Design a binder for these strands. Structure first.
Lengths: 62, 99, 213, 132, 135, 189
RNA sequence: CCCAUGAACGAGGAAUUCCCAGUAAGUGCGGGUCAUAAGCUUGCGUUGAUUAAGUCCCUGCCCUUUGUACACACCGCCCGU
């Protein structure tokens, strides 16, 4: 469970029967830099920084 | 009136075509009328690839694939959104979607 | 009430001589209590094991069913029981604009083993072909199937089981069929798809030992 | 949204094509000149038109835009249209010619010409894309 | 009790993951398949019909299976997943993916991955009528 | 003479790293000698997040319909017993200050699934700011319930507020409720 | 308005209306009605903000295709002793 600092590249939008979860895409900084995606709750600004405390959480899309 | 020139099937120059069963309902639909998909997916979803690759005994194992032939009746294929109703002019198009 | 793994011994099952890897895994069996004998519970159990785990320089989509024949020194000695291909490999080969030709022969070796070999082959599209579908006509298919059966019989009826499996390990029969039938219709992926044994000669302990080196 | 309606778009376009000379880039100057040369009956609309003309000059300073036909850019473009190279591209000393076209030329009473180098035709008859 | 031979290598068993749409099975057995190490389904983990085939029940069963295999000596598994097969559906249920991922993530090593669902050379009539099922 | 407040100073509190200032950020005009900077924190999103941590903790406690937003309460509370404890301590509150809350904090929350079903929630995280502030809001509720129908009152928990404020270890209560929910939701990872 | 004679004295059947920042809500004040007649309404300030900067799930709308035996237009039409 490593704390990894990643940069937001693109924010998808909201999901739910009424809308309750927010999709973003994050690129790592020092882990053989690549891009993954993850869902997230609450305000996450334009191009802010995410903390991937775990390197395996993937969010299902649609 | 006649909605389609081929009657929505691929039967030309023969009388009877053996029927198959829709993969969802098991409806009897002629093999040429049925909507056929050929899914070639990874046995491991792209989300679960990393764990099984890390836990793999054999380096460079290349995980196998699931090959499935899916037959759909028109009702189930419409409901599953595999096909959609199209306009009178766009109905004639036979080109598969670009994807 | 009773833990059943405290009364279960672990045995090692061995591959015959033709395979580089000798130990393929381990097997559980209950201790010899009462009427039941551990040497009777281990005389017909089959291991479907990939060839790549048997030969360090072979393909992974070839599975071999190896059957234990006798247990001594708490080691089970296996023998060739069958050959087959993984389902994913077989499904990856059946494409939709080519002819699939299947053949099979029942044939006995020179040690009495009776094998039913199934070979499969697929019509190859030429490198400059513009035609979408490469279909062999029915007489071409018949000729290819006759050649398949002739080659399989020629390879099996003369060699004993040891040399038959030696040929099966690199699929020499498939390559021979592919080379032969090039003049009828170019085939693409020729394989002895399956080998199943119908009857076997009466057990010879010395035969199995000589089989292991 | 800040979408500029047809009124401000058309006014800015006509303003920029008619008096491109006076108009510039700094909003204060665009507003001043727009008031001076355009009878705009509002002040908010005047600021909107000046802002869009500023955007259009940011557009023109980095290439031509299809909406306007200013005299200077069109003059440069037509100047480019009378371009003529020193040596015509049809002044080829040697022209590579296949057997069939040289047969045509011989049947054309033009066979004495020595400019046409008869080439080796391609031996493959593969020219149609595969089907599927 | 268990094989403590060649500690630096792997001990291989096989898990038969029967991922039906009703529920999911995780069945680790001897390499020959004759002797069974441990079987956990999705139904003995959850008290609900709808969650029997859920990924949660499959993950719980896979974790329990991996724990039992670790304590019993087995270190690696060959995956043999399979759907209902027969004339019925050939698509593995929702529990296959989660169960396999949880086996990978629970201190186990994956060997060879195969699909062994039955595919008839042709079958009998399916449980529906000629008009299918209409709900 | 650029010392923050009258008793701290910014010339020595350094982390030699310019990326861990997500909680204490005193390097520019945003520094306050007294959090009563007035203003609004609901005009547009991310402007409640751009509140300083101190002012968010001191204000956000405004709830019920009678003490709703009356900034005089927040400023009087943060002045009272603060003026007292600064002289009566002598030592540094830094230890507890930091080491209860600002790494009591959880590391995930949960969100809705599919199109129906209210029997479990899928585990997601946030960039630690939103999670930490939701924990702070529930800790405000907890400080209420430790005052509301209880013994220890409001405007005497300045130790607990400093605990809620500063930087980096784990001792909380509402946050361990949040961590129990953490584990419950993470049972789906 | 003053004597403090004590009223489940600390978030509420089914069904639920209104509301996104000086929102809501708490308050009072001025007009319309009129005898300084308001508990209504129309405005005005003072105190003042927890939640969401989303989606089409419910209700409903719209720049498309599609089906119809409806056109009094789906609260239609219509079948059956």
């Amino acid at each position: 469970q490593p704390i990894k600092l990643a940069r937001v590249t693109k924010v998808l939008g909201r999901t739910g029967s009424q809308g309750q979860c927010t999709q973003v895409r994050v690129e790592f900084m020092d882990d053989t830099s690549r891009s993954i995606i993850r869902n997230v709750k609450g305000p996450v600004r334009e191009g802010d920084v995410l903390t991937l405390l775990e390197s395996e959480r993937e969010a299902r899309r649609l | 009136t006649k909605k389609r020139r081929n009657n929505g099937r691929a039967k030309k120059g023969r009388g009877h075509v053996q029927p198959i069963r829709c993969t969802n309902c098991a409806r009897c639909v002629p093999k040429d009328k049925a909507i056929k998909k050929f899914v070639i997916r990874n046995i491991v979803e792209a989300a679960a690839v990393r764990d099984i690759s890390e836990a793999s005994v054999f380096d460079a194992y290349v995980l196998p694939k699931l090959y499935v032939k899916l037959h759909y009746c028109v009702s189930c294929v419409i409901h599953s959104k595999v096909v959609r109703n199209r306009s009178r002019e766009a109905r004639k198009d036979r080109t598969p979607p670009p994807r | 009430v009773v833990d059943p793994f405290s009364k279960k011994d672990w045995y090692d099952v061995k591959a015959p001589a033709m395979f580089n890897i000798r130990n393929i895994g381990k097997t559980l069996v209950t201790r010899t209590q009462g009427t039941k004998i551990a040497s009777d519970g281990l005389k017909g159990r089959v291991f479907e094991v990939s060839l790549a785990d048997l030969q360090n320089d072979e393909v992974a989509f070839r599975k071999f069913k190896l059957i234990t024949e006798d247990v001594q020194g708490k080691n089970c000695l296996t023998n060739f029981h069958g050959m087959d291909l993984t389902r994913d490999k077989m499904c990856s080969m059946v494409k939709k604009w080519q002819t699939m030709i299947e053949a099979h022969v029942d044939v006995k070796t020179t040690d009495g083993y009776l094998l039913r070999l199934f070979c499969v082959g697929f019509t190859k599209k030429r490198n400059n072909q513009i035609r979408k579908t490469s279909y062999a006509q029915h007489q071409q298919v018949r000729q290819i199937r006759k050649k398949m059966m002739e080659i399989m019989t020629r390879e099996v009826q003369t060699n004993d089981l040891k040399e038959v499996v030696n040929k099966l390990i690199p699929d020499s029969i498939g390559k021979d069929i592919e080379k032969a039938c090039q003049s009828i219709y170019p085939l693409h992926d020729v394989f002895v798809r399956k080998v199943k044994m119908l009857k076997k000669p009466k057990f010879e302990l010395g035969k199995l030992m000589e089989l292991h080196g | 949204g800040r979408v500029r309606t047809k009124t401000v778009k058309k006014a800015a376009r006509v303003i920029i094509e008619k008096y491109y000379t006076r108009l510039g880039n700094d909003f204060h100057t665009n507003k001043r000149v727009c008031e001076e040369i355009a009878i705009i009956p509002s002040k908010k609309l005047r600021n909107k038109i000046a802002g869009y003309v500023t955007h259009l000059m940011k557009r023109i300073q980095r290439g031509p835009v299809r909406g306007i036909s200013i005299k200077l850019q069109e003059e440069e473009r037509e100047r480019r249209d009378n371009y003529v190279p020193e040596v015509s591209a049809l002044d080829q000393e040697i022209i590579e010619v296949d057997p069939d076209t040289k047969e045509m030329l011989k049947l054309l009473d033009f066979g004495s010409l020595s400019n046409l180098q008869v080439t080796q035709p391609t031996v493959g008859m593969n020219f149609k894309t595969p089907r599927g | 009790l268990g094989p403590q031979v060649a500690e630096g290598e792997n001990v291989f068993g096989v898990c038969h993951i029967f991922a039906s749409f009703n529920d999911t099975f995780v069945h680790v057995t001897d390499l020959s398949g004759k002797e069974t190490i441990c079987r956990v389904t999705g139904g003995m983990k959850v008290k609900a019909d709808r969650d029997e085939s859920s990924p949660y029940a499959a993950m719980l069963a896979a974790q329990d299976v991996a724990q039992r295999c670790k304590e019993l000596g087995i270190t690696a598994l060959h995956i043999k997943l399979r759907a209902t097969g027969g004339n019925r559906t050939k698509t593995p249920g929702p529990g296959a993916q989660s169960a396999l991922r949880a086996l990978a993530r629970s201190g186990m090593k994956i060997g060879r991955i195969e699909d062994v669902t039955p595919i008839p050379s042709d079958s009998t009539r399916r449980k529906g009528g000629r008009r299918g099922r209409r709900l | 003479d650029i010392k923050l407040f009258g008793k701290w100073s910014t010339d020595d509190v350094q982390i030699n790293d310019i990326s861990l200032q997500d909680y204490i950020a005193v390097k520019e005009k945003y520094a306050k000698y007294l959090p009563h900077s007035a203003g609004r924190y609901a005009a547009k999103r991310f402007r409640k997040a751009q509140c300083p941590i101190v002012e968010r903790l001191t204000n956000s406690m405004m709830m019920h319909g009678r003490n709703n937003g009356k900034k005089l309460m927040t400023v009087r509370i943060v002045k009272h017993a603060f003026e007292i404890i600064h002289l009566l301590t002598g030592e540094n509150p830094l230890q507890v200050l930091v080491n209860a809350i600002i790494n009591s904090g959880p590391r995930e929350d949960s969100t809705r699934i599919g199109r129906a079903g209210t029997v479990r929630r899928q585990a997601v995280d946030v960039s630690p700011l939103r999670r930490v502030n939701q924990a702070i809001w529930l800790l405000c509720t907890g400080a209420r319930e430790a005052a509301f129908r209880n013994i220890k009152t409001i405007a005497e928990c300045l130790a607990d507020e400093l605990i809620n404020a500063a930087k980096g270890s784990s001792n909380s209560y509402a946050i361990k409720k949040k961590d129990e929910l953490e584990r419950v939701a993470k049972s789906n990872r």
